[PDB]
Amino acid sequence: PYLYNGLQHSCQDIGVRSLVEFREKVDSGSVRFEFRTPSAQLEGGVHNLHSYELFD
Amino acid sequence: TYRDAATALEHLATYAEKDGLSVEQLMDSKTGGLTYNDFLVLPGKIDFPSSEVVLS
Amino acid sequence: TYRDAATALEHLATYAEKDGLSVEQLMDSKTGGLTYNDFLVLPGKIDFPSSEVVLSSRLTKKITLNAPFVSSPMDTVTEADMAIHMALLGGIGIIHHNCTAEEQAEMVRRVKKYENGFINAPVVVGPDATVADVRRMKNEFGFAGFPVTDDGKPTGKLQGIITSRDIQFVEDETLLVSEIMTKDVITGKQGINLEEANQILKNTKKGKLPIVDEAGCLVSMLSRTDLMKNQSYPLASKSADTKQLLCGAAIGTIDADRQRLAMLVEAGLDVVVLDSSQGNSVFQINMIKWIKETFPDLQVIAGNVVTREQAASLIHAGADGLRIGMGSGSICITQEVMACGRPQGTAVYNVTQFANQFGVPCIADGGVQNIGHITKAIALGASTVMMGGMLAGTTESPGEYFRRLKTYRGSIDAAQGVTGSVIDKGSIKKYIPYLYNGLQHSCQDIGVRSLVEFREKVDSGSVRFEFRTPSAQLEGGVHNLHSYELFD
Amino acid sequence: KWIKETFPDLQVIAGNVVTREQAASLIHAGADGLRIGMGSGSICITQEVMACGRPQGT
Amino acid sequence: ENGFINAPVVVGPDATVADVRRMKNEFGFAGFPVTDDGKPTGKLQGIITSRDIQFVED
Amino acid sequence: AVYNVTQFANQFGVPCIADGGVQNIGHITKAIALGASTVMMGGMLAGTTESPGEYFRDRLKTYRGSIDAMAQGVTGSVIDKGSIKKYI
Ligand SMILES: Nc1ncnc2c1ncn2[C@@H]1O[C@H](COP(=O)(O)OP(=O)(O)OP(=O)(O)O)[C@@H](O)[C@H]1O
Ligand SMILES: Nc1nc2c(ncn2[C@@H]2O[C@H](COP(=O)(O)OP(=O)(O)O)[C@@H](O)[C@H]2O)c(=O)[nH]1
Ligand SMILES: Nc1nc2c(ncn2[C@@H]2O[C@H](COP(=O)(O)OP(=O)(O)O)[C@@H](O)[C@H]2O)c(=O)[nH]1
Ligand SMILES: Nc1nc2c(ncn2[C@@H]2O[C@H](COP(=O)(O)OP(=O)(O)O)[C@@H](O)[C@H]2O)c(=O)[nH]1
Ligand SMILES: Nc1nc2c(ncn2[C@@H]2O[C@H](COP(=O)(O)OP(=O)(O)O)[C@@H](O)[C@H]2O)c(=O)[nH]1
Ligand SMILES: Nc1nc2c(ncn2[C@@H]2O[C@H](COP(=O)(O)O)[C@@H](O)[C@H]2O)c(=O)[nH]1
Ligand SMILES: Nc1nc2c(ncn2[C@@H]2O[C@H](COP(=O)(O)O)[C@@H](O)[C@H]2O)c(=O)[nH]1
């Protein structure tokens, strides 16, 4: 249920109401992407912290 | 002088293509050989709750 | 044979374009997806000192700061203490909303009341109160200068004034205020303007100057220490009319936060930030339209956004500023959890290239840990930069120290984030001037006399950049050393 | 300029520079040599602190 | 911390505001009795303190 | 050392400082329990705001008969501790 709910929120952030709509919006060029430089992958996660302790 | 906020959406037209990459532009092999951590999906417009998303 | 040195500058002409890259050449996405550490700004020509650099920066269409520094709305960074000092030192703080609406408005209230010109509705006391009561009020409010009114109300008849030195060494805490208060109080007649009332205050060398009307009723008061706070902080961010420090606050976009905003507005809020991981939503658009016509004098910063299309939407809604960043923040996982986000450098450039055309300043939010990131964020189009982890661990940030570290947190505790810890950093009364001075020197190295000139020289192709290979990032920092031990 | 006409027999190395435009300026001033590098040094942080510098090879 | 400040730091009437500000930075306090000869045991002519020089522009 | 010096010194009303090896409250109690009249603190109080010097690896302050001071000692570093107005 956590992965399920998580995928729902991510589809919302992208602006698609369903995975079927997700597939159509990608093939039509509506959904957009960005290449990931090794430095941006560090930003996307945790960085610049002494320690860090998802669900439950 | 600046542009009128009323024209913000009208002004999006003056740009060649949408911000970001289409999936085609992201996956051509000659420009290549990437995995999940090498790209992000850009966000769109939200006009529905996350509980409304179908994952069929 | 060689060329004559006389022709060195003439020979620069024979080259197609200037050494390095323009910002356009640096940010095309097809050749892509880069962040602050992937590029440098090339130096220019220095013909001025670093003290000459102006760092005036637009926070919204109407608000300008003397420094482009904005403390982030997180319950481990920005409450009243942080917001007050960020404002005094040339920036502004955005108070967090991880608290009830009454608690957040009180925090705003304490920021707006820290420094005044005319203290409106000053805390008063009745003649029946005791020394024990006046001591309790000092512990609650932080000051002890209380005009004494006949009915105990701010607008009652002025009977006297009591201050720290009137109760300092009083042994009997049961005495009445009326017995030890100073009754012959020097005042100024209402209608007197600020410059005139400041002069009366100065000449008496007294702490306060209550303002009274013709009936003898209190209306406002002046404090000698507000004249001191001004002299100590000549760059403070404060309203020109009221002389109070500018204060900001974050809210959600659900129904309950419409009443929340009203209570913040009541408390004197100057700018509101719409706190959202993905701001281009119908819920936030409606909020922006509703704030422009319900509190038109309030400046609205929408966000977060990372794309040109998002910016167009929220600008068209009437946004006065944009907050840029999605997942680039320290202790932020939206990109791992939602697969959705953007490299911060690329987000700033492509939003600000669009937003600046409409005169909508943008906050570069997330991923900032040092002076170089600030410089680069502005170089790409940002007008200010938001700081979270950098300022967490300072003395002004809210919390208690404890493997010196402070716990740092939008996680399940507050999942699109994590809980963590940052190191102690001392007071921002030293740290902010350091970033300020540091940005001045970097503007000198680049050859720009101001951030406004910085923005023009980038867009014209004057300022140049260079792509950063993973190997050059190691050169730019420390390398090839056994150990290494900034400021202080 | 002041060293070339006050101690003409003294050789002057100017720097540091990392761009063609910088070099042209200091050569036009009469430099006899150029010192190249900004932030590429061991224990050097100008690039982190000033955001300004350049990869050394380039 | 004192009870009776033995030999308190004094100032002469010839000293200026600029001088009293320098002394505040050196010694850390601005409460100066003013003596006719500038010596601690001179005749008392007055006293000057933080509030007497705080907002003086000359 | 504390016990055997103080067992003799206290008989003459000569208070003794228990000097060295103190890092927490428990050492202070034990020092006094064995005969000491006061306790001297070095590393404990280094790294506080009132202690002299400046901060700077891996909030630390350099500490310390060391060759630098002048070898019967070493040079080191201690952690920041805040003000003794709370610590004492
Ligand atoms: N505006 C005033 N008119 C007349 N008497 C005043 C006025 N303000 C203060 N006093 C009197 O002067 C003394 C306090 O002056 P002030 O209020 O200027 O000192 P404070 O407020 O005690 O600050 P500090 O802590 O530096 O003394 C008290 O005895 C008070 O009654
Ligand atoms: N009572 C009071 N007067 C102030 C305050 N701040 C500025 N002033 C007055 O406003 C005038 C100009 O102040 P200035 O330093 O030039 O600019 P400002 O700090 O932005 O207001 C001066 O006469 C000040 O006495 C304040 O906080 N309280
Ligand atoms: N006395 C008083 N000060 C206030 C009030 N509201 C805000 N302040 C501010 O709190 C500060 C008080 O400083 P100070 O006068 O030195 O404290 P006090 O001597 O005990 O009154 C001033 O900057 C005031 O502008 C109020 O209602 N009463
Ligand atoms: N002027 C001045 N008087 C003091 C000082 N310390 C104590 N006194 C006075 O000496 C008397 C006794 O003070 P007390 O409370 O017993 O503390 P103690 O004197 O320090 O032991 C009181 O009248 C105090 O006001 C001081 O440092 N300066
Ligand atoms: N004013 C003054 N204070 C002294 C002197 N020597 C020691 N002190 C101590 O310094 C402190 C100064 O008090 P403070 O309230 O700072 O006075 P001010 O700043 O000069 O108004 C007091 O505890 C004094 O006993 C001196 O020579 N002049
Ligand atoms: N994706 C995500 N971003 C957050 C969260 N909390 C704060 N942020 C962003 O991260 C910024 C601070 O990041 P920092 O400056 O520490 O790198 C904040 O100003 C805010 O924009 C969260 O829970 N999830
Ligand atoms: N940015 C910067 N460069 C320095 C500093 N000190 C020395 N350098 C440069 O670094 C060079 C030595 O670097 P190394 O050869 O150890 O890699 C020096 O010759 C000088 O050019 C400094 O404090 N800041």
Numbering used by the authors:
A (entry chain A): 465 to 517, 520 to 522
B (entry chain A): 2 to 32, 34 to 58
C (entry chain A): 2 to 32, 34 to 404, 406, 410 to 415, 418 to 422, 447 to 517, 520 to 522
D (entry chain A): 291 to 348
E (entry chain B): 117 to 174
F (entry chain B): 349 to 404, 406 to 407, 410 to 415, 418 to 423, 447 to 464
Q: What did the study's authors say about this model?
A:
The comparison of both structures allowed us to decipher the molecular details of a novel regulatory mechanism mediated by Bateman domains that respond differently to adenine or guanine nucleotides. These nucleotides control a conformational switch that allosterically regulates the catalytic activity of IMPDH.
We further investigated these findings by solving the structure of AgIMPDH co-crystallized with ATP and GDP at 2.5 Å resolution. The overall structure of AgIMPDH-ATP/GDP was essentially identical to that of GDP octamers with only small variations, which were most probably due to differences in the crystal packing. The binding modes of ATP1 and GDP2/GDP3 in this structure were essentially identical to the binding modes observed for these nucleotides in their respective ATP and GDP complex structures. Therefore, the occupancy of the second canonical and the third non-canonical nucleotide binding sites of the Bateman domain determined the conformation of AgIMPDH octamers and, therefore, its catalytic activity. The upper panel of Fig. 5A clearly shows that GDP was able to inhibit the active octamers induced by ATP. In contrast, ATP could not activate the inhibited octamers induced by GDP. It also implies that the conformational switch is unidirectional, i.e. guanine nucleotides can inhibit ATP-induced octamers, but ATP cannot reverse GDP inhibition.
